[PDB]
Every structure is written in C-alpha cells, then in structure tokens.
Design an enzyme around this catalytic site. Sequence first.
Site, PDB file in Angstrom:
ATOM      1  N   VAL A   1       0.845  -1.224   0.000  1.00 17.77           N
ATOM      2  CA  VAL A   1       0.000   0.000   0.000  1.00 17.77           C
ATOM      3  C   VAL A   1       0.875   1.267   0.000  1.00 17.77           C
ATOM      4  O   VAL A   1       0.303   2.379   0.010  1.00 17.77           O
ATOM      5  CB  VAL A   1      -1.004  -0.010   1.162  1.00 17.77           C
ATOM      6  CG1 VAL A   1      -1.940  -1.210   1.054  1.00 17.77           C
ATOM      7  CG2 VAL A   1      -0.313   0.045   2.531  1.00 17.77           C
ATOM      8  N   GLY A   2       2.201   1.144  -0.032  1.00 21.74           N
ATOM      9  CA  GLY A   2       3.088   2.315  -0.012  1.00 21.74           C
ATOM     10  C   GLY A   2       4.539   1.891  -0.100  1.00 21.74           C
ATOM     11  O   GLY A   2       4.911   0.889   0.549  1.00 21.74           O
TER      12      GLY A   2
ATOM     13  N   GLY B   1       8.536   3.951  -0.531  1.00 23.00           N
ATOM     14  CA  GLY B   1       9.257   5.230  -0.584  1.00 23.00           C
ATOM     15  C   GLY B   1      10.632   5.056   0.001  1.00 23.00           C
ATOM     16  O   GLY B   1      11.040   3.898   0.227  1.00 23.00           O
TER      17      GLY B   1
ATOM     18  N   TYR C   1      11.297   5.646   3.008  1.00 30.36           N
ATOM     19  CA  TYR C   1      11.041   5.100   4.375  1.00 30.36           C
ATOM     20  C   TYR C   1      11.185   3.576   4.366  1.00 30.36           C
ATOM     21  O   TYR C   1      11.465   2.987   5.420  1.00 30.36           O
ATOM     22  CB  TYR C   1       9.654   5.479   4.929  1.00 30.36           C
ATOM     23  CG  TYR C   1       8.456   5.122   4.078  1.00 30.36           C
ATOM     24  CD1 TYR C   1       7.987   6.003   3.119  1.00 30.36           C
ATOM     25  CD2 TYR C   1       7.785   3.911   4.225  1.00 30.36           C
ATOM     26  CE1 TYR C   1       6.894   5.705   2.321  1.00 30.36           C
ATOM     27  CE2 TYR C   1       6.693   3.599   3.432  1.00 30.36           C
ATOM     28  CZ  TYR C   1       6.232   4.504   2.494  1.00 30.36           C
ATOM     29  OH  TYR C   1       5.171   4.222   1.687  1.00 30.36           O
ATOM     30  N   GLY C   2      10.925   2.931   3.239  1.00 30.41           N
ATOM     31  CA  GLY C   2      10.699   1.485   3.199  1.00 30.41           C
ATOM     32  C   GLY C   2       9.362   1.242   2.536  1.00 30.41           C
ATOM     33  O   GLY C   2       9.107   1.816   1.459  1.00 30.41           O
ATOM     34  N   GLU C   3       8.575   0.342   3.078  1.00 28.18           N
ATOM     35  CA  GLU C   3       7.342  -0.103   2.420  1.00 28.18           C
ATOM     36  C   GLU C   3       6.336  -0.389   3.504  1.00 28.18           C
ATOM     37  O   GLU C   3       6.750  -0.830   4.615  1.00 28.18           O
ATOM     38  CB  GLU C   3       7.526  -1.415   1.664  1.00 28.18           C
ATOM     39  CG  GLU C   3       8.554  -1.362   0.576  1.00 28.18           C
ATOM     40  CD  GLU C   3       8.870  -2.726  -0.009  1.00 28.18           C
ATOM     41  OE1 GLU C   3       8.439  -3.760   0.588  1.00 28.18           O
ATOM     42  OE2 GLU C   3       9.551  -2.738  -1.069  1.00 28.18           O
ATOM     43  N   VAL C   4       5.075  -0.205   3.183  1.00 23.06           N
ATOM     44  CA  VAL C   4       3.960  -0.645   4.045  1.00 23.06           C
ATOM     45  C   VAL C   4       3.102  -1.622   3.266  1.00 23.06           C
ATOM     46  O   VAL C   4       2.744  -1.315   2.096  1.00 23.06           O
ATOM     47  CB  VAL C   4       3.129   0.517   4.609  1.00 23.06           C
ATOM     48  CG1 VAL C   4       2.055  -0.026   5.513  1.00 23.06           C
ATOM     49  CG2 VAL C   4       3.971   1.498   5.394  1.00 23.06           C
TER      50      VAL C   4
ATOM     51  N   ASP D   1       7.049  15.217  13.270  1.00 23.18           N
ATOM     52  CA  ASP D   1       6.805  15.080  11.820  1.00 23.18           C
ATOM     53  C   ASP D   1       5.302  15.009  11.537  1.00 23.18           C
ATOM     54  O   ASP D   1       4.888  14.148  10.770  1.00 23.18           O
ATOM     55  CB  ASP D   1       7.592  13.925  11.232  1.00 23.18           C
ATOM     56  CG  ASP D   1       7.644  13.866   9.711  1.00 23.18           C
ATOM     57  OD1 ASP D   1       7.496  14.928   9.098  1.00 23.18           O
ATOM     58  OD2 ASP D   1       7.789  12.745   9.182  1.00 23.18           O
TER      59      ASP D   1
END
Lengths: 292, 283
Positions: free
Chosen positions: A10-11, A13, A15-18, A129
């Site tokens: 679902v995401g 970037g 950051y990594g992944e979800v 953030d």
Amino acid sequence: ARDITLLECVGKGRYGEVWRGSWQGENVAVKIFSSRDEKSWFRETELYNTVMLRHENILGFIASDMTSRHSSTQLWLITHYHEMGSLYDYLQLTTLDTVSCLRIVLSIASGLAHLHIEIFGKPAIAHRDLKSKNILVKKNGQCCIADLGLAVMHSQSTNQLDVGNNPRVGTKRYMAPEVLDETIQVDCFDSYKRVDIWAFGLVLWEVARRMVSNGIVEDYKPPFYDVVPNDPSFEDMRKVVCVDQQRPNIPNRWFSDPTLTSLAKLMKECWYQNPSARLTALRIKKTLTKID
Amino acid sequence: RTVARDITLLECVGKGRYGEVWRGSWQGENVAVKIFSSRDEKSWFRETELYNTVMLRHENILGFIASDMTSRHSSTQLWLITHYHEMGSLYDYLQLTTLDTVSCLRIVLSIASGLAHLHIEIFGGKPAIAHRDLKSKNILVKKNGQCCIADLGLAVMHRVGTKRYMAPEVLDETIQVDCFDSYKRVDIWAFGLVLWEVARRMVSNGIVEDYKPPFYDVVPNDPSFEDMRKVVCVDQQRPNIPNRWFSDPTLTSLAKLMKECWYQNPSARLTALRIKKTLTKID
Ligand SMILES: COc1cc(-c2cncc(-c3ccc(C4CCN(C)CC4)cc3)c2C)cc(OC)c1OC
Ligand SMILES: COc1cc(-c2cncc(-c3ccc(C4CCN(C)CC4)cc3)c2C)cc(OC)c1OC
Ligand SMILES: COc1cc(-c2cncc(-c3ccc(C4CCN(C)CC4)cc3)c2C)cc(OC)c1OC
Ligand SMILES: COc1cc(-c2cncc(-c3ccc(C4CCN(C)CC4)cc3)c2C)cc(OC)c1OC
C-alpha cells in the site's frame, strides 16, 4: 498465534514499504523499514513500549521486530490497518461538510493533546513530523496520528528530556520557522511541542480548504504549493517561511462561514514566528470542542 | 508471502530476576528465547539498540536471531531470540566436567577471541564494544569445544555488573567513566576470574580442584558491594593459585596470564589481543 501473511503493498518510498497483511484473520499494516531509517524503527519501538500511549487517535501498535541472519537485517512494525488510508489520500477525492471537517480536526487535536500531556505512566511526547500523510482516517470519521520515529519524550517529575538518537529531520514542507532557520532551542521540550503546533496549523488549513460553504470548496493543495518548487528543498522552505514570512493564504469565501472563520483564526494562532505565542494542543482541542 | 513467527516454547532452561530463558523451536530448528522481566526491560533495549547499530557475527559471540516486542492487554512482552547451545553455560559445564590441556586452552582461547572481537573497532566494520558483565554464566559451551559470549544488555559502544566479578576501580568508584578503555579493562579483570574458574577444572598429575566461583573462600553467597570492596580494594586479595599448577606448564602459563589481568592499576592489565597471542604460544 504469531504468523502474518503479506497481501499487498500500500506504499513504497525512501522510508521502506507498508503492506496490508493478515494476522489471526484480521487486516494489519506491516511497515518494513529501509536500512537508511533504522534509527526511526528503534525510536518508534521505544515510544510504543509505553502501554499508556494507547489512544483512539494514535495508530495502535501490535508488534515490533528486528530479525537477522548473516549480514542482512529486517526491521518490522505491525499496527492496526486503516483501509481508508491517510488524510492526505482522503482529502484528494472527498469534500467535507461542517460536521465531518470538525470531527477530523478535533480528533487530530485530541491525539496531539494526548501526546503532549504527561500521564503520571506516559511521558509528554512531541511528534516532530506531523503532516497529513502521517494521519490515518478511520471509518468512524475520526483520525489517528502515525509515525513516532522522530518523537521526543519529557518527564516533568524527574526533569528528564529524551531527544533520542535519530538524525532524521521533519518533512521540509511542514517545518516551523525555528526548524528552517535552525535557531530552535534543542534542550527545551516546549520547543518541540511548538513545532507540532505549527504543523498542526498547516494540517488544519489543508482540511478546511476541503470543507464546502455556500457551494464553494478549494481543490486539495499541500501547504505552500503556490510559493515553492515541486519537491521543495530545505532552503526553498526557509526562503518562503523565514525570509518572505509567508503563511498559507485564507480564501476569502471562508469569512462568510462562521466555522471556517473560527478555523482561520485558530490556524493563524498556530503560525506566529514567536513559538511561545502559539496556542497549546489542549487549547486547540478546547476551542474545537466549542466551535460548530 | 507467509512470515512464520510462531515459536514453540519447549523447556525453561533458566529463571531469575532478568526473566526466563526457554529452549524453543522455529521451523524445526532449536532457538533460545529470553523473556525479559519488567525489572530488566532496559537490557532488552540496550542489546536491541546495539544489534540495530552493528549486526555482530562471530563464532564466539552468541548468535542473534531476533528482538521481538509484542503489545499485550496490560503490558509489553519483550523477547530476545538467539542460537541455542544445548550444552548450556560454562558455569553449568564446569560443575561436573573436568578438562585436559587441549580442551582447557580451546575454551579460554575461544573466550579471548570473542572478547577481542567485541573490544576492537573495525573501520569501513564495527564500533568497539565493552561487555560489562563477563562471567561464566554469560558464556555458553558449543559442541565443537569452543565457547561463545552472551548477554550484551550492559554493553557500551565507542543494572550494574555482577558484584563478585567487579574490578577494583568499579568497587572503589575510581573508574575513569569518560574513557572507553576503562570498560575494556573492567572486562579483562573479569576474564582473568573466568580463566581461574576454568583452569581449576583442568586435570594435571591426577589432580583437579572442585568447581568454585571466584572469591568463594573470602565472601558470602550474594556478596555485598562492601564485602567485595574490602576483599578486592582494601586487602587487595586475589584468587589462590594452587601449588599443583606449578608442576604443569599449561597451568603455570595460565597463572601468569591471570596475574596480568588482575593488576590494581587498570592500564597495567593485558589487552584481549595480547591474551590471544599468549594463549596461541602455550603448548
Ligand atoms: C531471522 O532468522 C532467520 C531468517 C530466515 C529467512 C527467512 N526468509 C528469508 C530470508 C532472507 C532471504 C533473502 C535475503 C536477502 C538476500 C540477498 N539480497 C537480495 C537481500 C535480501 C535476506 C533474508 C531469511 C534469512 C531464515 C532463518 O533460518 C534458516 C533464520 O534463522 C532462524
Ligand atoms: C503513516 O505511517 C504509517 C501508516 C500505516 C498505515 C496503516 N493503515 C493504512 C495505511 C494505508 C492503507 C492504504 C492506503 C492507500 C494506498 C493507495 N490508495 C491511496 C488507496 C489506499 C494508504 C495508507 C497505512 C499506510 C502503517 C504504518 O506502520 C505499520 C505507518 O508507519 C508508522
Ligand atoms: C517479523 O517477525 C519475525 C519474522 C521472521 C521471519 C520469518 N519468515 C521470513 C522472514 C523474512 C526475512 C527476510 C525477508 C527479506 C527477503 C529479501 N527482501 C529483499 C527483503 C526482505 C523476508 C522475510 C522473517 C524475518 C522470524 C521471526 O522469528 C524467528 C520473527 O519474529 C521475531
Ligand atoms: C547467558 O544468557 C543467555 C543464554 C541463552 C542460552 C542459549 N543457549 C542455551 C542455553 C541453555 C540451554 C540448556 C541449559 C541446560 C538444560 C538441559 N541440560 C540437561 C542442562 C543444560 C542451560 C542453558 C541458554 C541459557 C540465551 C540467551 O538469550 C536468548 C541468553 O541471554 C542473552
């Protein structure tokens, strides 16, 4: 029963992944961190150790894992899953009425006041953030705050300030003037609460644009969309916020609606260059409780 | 994809103030699961922060598998999952087992190897690490005759240590706390005590000493901080070297090595790398 099935990404970037996954036959969210952000994983894990952090308007924690074989490490955070996605996603393609607009912004204020106020336990917590991608929308029309990887903790009883070890900085678009000009007082807990208040004002503005009044609504735009480049740099943001003294513009149609007039007043009291002049999270929550 | 996280807990192999250690099974493989008490949560956080910083991989360091935090109704559950060593701790092993020259040297050289790996900074690599609670209960015995060092819950990178193993500068509070070498020197003191515990169980000329912990003859069980300070600091006692060791070249060399881990002056003590070199030249 501990096993998880990863079902869909679902995401993705920096950051990594979800992932949407399944655990004991329920949806869960599984964040797999990039190695670049290992210090966020550890900080978020320190924050979620606190049982009294649990709150309707804070993303609910299930588990945290660091796994390794040989030279490879994986970093996992498992939370509640909110299939409506982030507030950023939601505002793209929905408009709001008065009731829905106030329910969303009161819920975020409730979460933020819960973070900021010490329970005697849960330390006082500043997020650092806050932004609309870090807020999830729930089917009850309330929101919950996510991503405690940059959080600062403070205990009044013991005079302890825990700023953590993470060289990550906040999302540039939402950085307060004192963050962008780097004059923020780093050994002052109240400084970090005041950075959250600035960012909250920006999220209020994003939401209020999407509330209809008198048949008029604004399109979704991120803060400072009109005055900085795409993918603004730190210096791009410093220019508009610190040099040009810019703040998001209030659409004049808001002044015909009592709700949006009250919200414009509130977001302006989050945006003082003087951090000590800004409202507290508790005061914002009380004001939003009284607004209709 | 399926991420199999179930661990079957089979047998409790340790229970204390720290919590419990279990033999468990994951995907047909033995693992060790340390379940932390609320009293000792900071040990889980420190070891986890260290492994998040540097994924240590060494034959003489207990092998990391996972750090797990799980939300419960009313609490947070903290597990550390590692390799499982069915022979148990060196403390356990020395209780009934005696050693010969080869098995004694292999044990102590493996410990020195693990300790030098912790202590050394490697560039481009790992930060230097001091253990701060080295003792025979924190060393596991492998089937190949080597050992590995366990429990980095007090480790420092560049809860207090077990009092029986505290160096004099810890007991007299003169330790130079802003000098990372201070912490290496505290580990060397403790290493010397472990070397004494092991050497006693090495047979020579048909003689062996019974297992005893360091200072068994001069302090009580669960000695106090003051009990230890008076022995180590005020009277400057050191563990006894039995006469029978001086008939055996290996135990004679090991007695000299112990002596040079136990100097009152921390900067006089041998380094882990120098202990390794000395051990490689015995026999
Ligand atoms: C935590 O512990 C254990 C984990 C596992 C395990 C299970 N699935 C997948 C993996 C894996 C696959 C591939 C990569 C790399 C390969 C190269 N490049 C592309 C980067 C990615 C990393 C990891 C592992 C290591 C097995 C274990 O035992 C056999 C473990 O030990 C108990
Ligand atoms: C912010 O941070 C975290 C968020 C989450 C998280 C939890 N529920 C749902 C979501 C989600 C699901 C779906 C969509 C969209 C994707 C495509 N389209 C727009 C429709 C659907 C967006 C978002 C997320 C991202 C989990 C995290 O950790 C496990 C987070 O990190 C702390
Ligand atoms: C979350 O929790 C636990 C997880 C596991 C575990 C179980 N199966 C597979 C894995 C695995 C490893 C590595 C990858 C890689 C593949 C390469 N790709 C490019 C990046 C990702 C995927 C999956 C893991 C880590 C075991 C556990 O206990 C032994 C866990 O609990 C502590
Ligand atoms: C020191 O500390 C840690 C140790 C361990 C650990 C690893 N392998 C094996 C052991 C063990 C197994 C078996 C026995 C007994 C039982 C059966 N037999 C008849 C006698 C021998 C004792 C000990 C342990 C205790 C794991 C840890 O973390 C997960 C530790 O903490 C860092």
